């Protein structure tokens, strides 16, 4: 592994966490 063991393509926008 240089990245993650199985692929997980972005099929949805990123939704960061900004709250508790």
């Amino acid at each position, epitope marked *: 592994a240089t990245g993650r063991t199985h692929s997980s393509p972005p099929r*949805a926008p990123s939704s960061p966490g900004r709250s508790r």
Partner: antibody
Amino acid sequence: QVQLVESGGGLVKPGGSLRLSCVSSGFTFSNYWMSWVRQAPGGGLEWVANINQDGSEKYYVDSVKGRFTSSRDNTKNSLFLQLNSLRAEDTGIYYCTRDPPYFDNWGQGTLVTVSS
Amino acid sequence: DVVLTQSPLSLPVILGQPASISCRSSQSLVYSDGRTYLNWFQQRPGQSPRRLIYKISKRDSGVPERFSGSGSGTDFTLEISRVEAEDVGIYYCMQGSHWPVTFGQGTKVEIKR
């Protein structure tokens, strides 16, 4: 063999509605995300919409949010795109595609014209 | 969005010669899972795009071996070792590593005869 057969495109006034259809064969339709991609005339490809396997996740490019909704019917092998409040720039060939971001198989295209 | 810049925008080629398309990304193209989701498409007049290359360098099943993908970081390259007449048309690169999916503006390959 994977087939994506599209239909439903035509002439429609600014602000009108039109419903694109994609009927697939040759694969397990419910295993794939599907995706719509449009090509403005003499133009580049623009991604439009994603829809997950069962329809619970639907994402859209910004220029269309609130105006387009995708849908799918896995017992009918069918993928739809409901166009609404159409604008001059929604004109183009609309393509059904399989499995973003791989896009391994494409429908034959269906032309959408927005005109008075 | 990521901007993919293709060059040259129009590529005239003598039949039988090498031909090379560049794709310069305004961003690295490695998704959080470590993979680069970069594709090349060929489009012939009045036809839907045909996928030639996926994940930088993997060739799809239909595709002749004269087509090859390569590159890393922000430069990627499509490469037709031996150009044939059937290869006229428009070629697009396409990145999928960062939301949302973006295409290059397309390079037209024309035969010099």
